Amino acid sequence: HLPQHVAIIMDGNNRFAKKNQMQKGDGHREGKNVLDPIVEHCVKTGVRALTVFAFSSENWNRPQYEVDLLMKLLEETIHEQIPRMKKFNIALRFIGDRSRLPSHLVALMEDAEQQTAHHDAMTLTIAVSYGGMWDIANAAKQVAQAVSRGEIDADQINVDLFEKYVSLNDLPAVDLLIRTGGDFRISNFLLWQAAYAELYFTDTLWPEFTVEEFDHALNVFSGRER
Amino acid sequence: SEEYHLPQHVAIIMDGNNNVLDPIVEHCVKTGVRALTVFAFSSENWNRPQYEVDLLMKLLEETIHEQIPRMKKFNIALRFIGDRSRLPSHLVALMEDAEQQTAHHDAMTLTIAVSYGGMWDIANAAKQVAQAVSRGEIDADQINVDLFEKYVSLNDLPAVDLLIRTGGDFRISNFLLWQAAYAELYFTDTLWPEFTVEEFDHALNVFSGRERR
Ligand SMILES: Cc1cc(C)c(C#N)[nH]1
Numbered sequence A: 001h002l003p004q005h006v007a008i009i010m011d012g013n014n015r016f017a018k019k020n021q022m023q024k025g026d027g028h029r030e031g032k033n034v035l036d037p038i039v040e041h042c043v044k045t046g047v048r049a050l051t052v053f054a055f056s057s058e059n060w061n062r063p064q065y066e067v068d069l070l071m072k073l074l075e076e077t078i079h080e081q082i083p084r085m086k087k088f089n090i091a092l093r094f095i096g097d098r099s100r101l102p103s104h105l106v107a108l109m110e111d112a113e114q115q116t117a118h119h120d121a122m123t124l125t126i127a128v129s130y131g132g133m134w135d136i137a138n139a140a141k142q143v144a145q146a147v148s149r150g151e152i153d154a155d156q157i158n159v160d161l162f163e164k165y166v167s168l169n170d171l172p173a174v175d176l177l178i179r180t181g182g183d184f185r186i187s188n189f190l191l192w193q194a195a196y197a198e199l200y201f202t203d204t205l206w207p208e209f210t211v212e213e214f215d216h217a218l219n220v221f222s223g224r225e226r
Numbered sequence B: 001s002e003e004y005h006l007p008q009h010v011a012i013i014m015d016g017n018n019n020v021l022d023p024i025v026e027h028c029v030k031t032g033v034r035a036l037t038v039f040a041f042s043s044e045n046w047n048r049p050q051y052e053v054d055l056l057m058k059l060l061e062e063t064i065h066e067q068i069p070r071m072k073k074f075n076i077a078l079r080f081i082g083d084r085s086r087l088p089s090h091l092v093a094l095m096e097d098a099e100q101q102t103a104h105h106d107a108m109t110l111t112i113a114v115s116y117g118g119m120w121d122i123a124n125a126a127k128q129v130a131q132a133v134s135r136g137e138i139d140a141d142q143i144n145v146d147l148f149e150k151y152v153s154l155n156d157l158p159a160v161d162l163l164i165r166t167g168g169d170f171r172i173s174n175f176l177l178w179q180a181a182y183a184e185l186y187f188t189d190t191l192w193p194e195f196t197v198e199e200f201d202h203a204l205n206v207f208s209g210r211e212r213r
C-alpha cells in the first residue's frame, strides 16, 4: 500500500554548497530543481498529496540575505510550476502565515492556487512562512472567533472539532514524513498532521536526493523494501 | 565541541512490551537532567479489549503506589498528563495524592503520560483558551503562539530536547507533538523491558555531541 500523503523536510542545501565548493546560496539554487522529478514520480505512482517544507517560521531569523534569496527563489519556483501544474493536473496550494510574506509574492500565490484549484490528480502543497506551532495557534484563534460569534459552545471543543481548523484538514493525514540532510528532528513542521506518520531519515543532502531513494522510502512504507 | 551539554528535558516512548524506569530516573538525578516525561498509556490504548484496559489500570495503580516512597526519598516531583475523565475514580484520587505530596520537590520532575495524546493535549489547550474568551478574560484576536503555548501541558518545564523511542519503529505516535517540535530524536531496536542505563547514557551523549550514532 502506497502512502496517501507524503511530507518532505528538504534539508542539506547549505552543507551541499560547502562540500561541492559552490557560491553562497547555490545549494538552494540546485535544491529547487530536485523537486520536479519527485513531483512527477508522485503523480505517475498515484500519491494523492505531497507537502514540502520550503520556508519555516524559524527561517525568518536566518541571515537576511538568505531570507531575500529564499523569497526570490520562491517567486521563481511558483512561476516555473504554474505551467507544470496545468500539464500534470496538479492542484497547487500554500500553507503558512501570509502576513509575514512580500505582498507581490502573496498575489502570485493566490493566482497559482486559484488557477489550479480544479486540478484533481494530486495536491502539491508548499509550506511558506509555516510552522506547526503557528498552524495550531492559528486554528485555536479561528475556533475562539467562532465562539465569539456564538456559533460554537467552548465546552464542546474537542479533537474532532479542532481538526477542522488546522491546515490541510481536507487532505488525508501525513502517513510518511521524509527528512534529508542527516538530522533526526521534526523541526516544527506538520506537528498535528503527522501525529501518526512513519518516518524516513537519510544522510542524503537535499540537492543530491534522487527519485530512486524517494521510491525506496515509498517501498519502505509499503513493505516492498526492508 | 569543547562543551558537552546534556538535554534539559528527555521524553521516552516505552515501546516493545508486547522496573526499567527506576535506574533511568536515578541517572537523570545523577547527570542533572531536570525533567523526564514517559508515555505510559495513550488515547489509542482505550480502543483495546476491556480485560487489557483493566490489567493496565491495575499496573498503573501498582506503579504509582511503588513510586510514591521513591519520589519522597529522592525529592522528585511526580506529575501526570492526559485526560482524567476516562479513568477510574480511585486511580484519579491516587494520582492527585502523588502529585500533591510531591509538587514542591525540586531534584527533578518525572511526568507520566496517562490516557494521553498530543492531539488531545492541543485541543484541550484550544478549549481552555476559548473558555477564557467566552468569560471575557481575553479577546480572540490576542491568540498567537506565545499565548497558546501557556495552555499546552508541561509549558513550565524546558521544551523536550531529546525524545527516545524504543521498540525499533521509526514513527510518530501522537506523543508530545507541541513540546518535542525541536527535539533531537533517538530511535533504537532495543525493546523497552531490555532498555539499559548504559544505552540511556549513550542517547544523552549523542545529544551532547560527546558520542556519535
Ligand atoms: C514531535 C515528535 C516526534 C516523535 C517521534 C513524536 C512522537 N510520538 N513526536
Ligand SMILES: [Ca+2]
Binding pocket: B139, B140, B141
Ligand atoms: Ca476581537
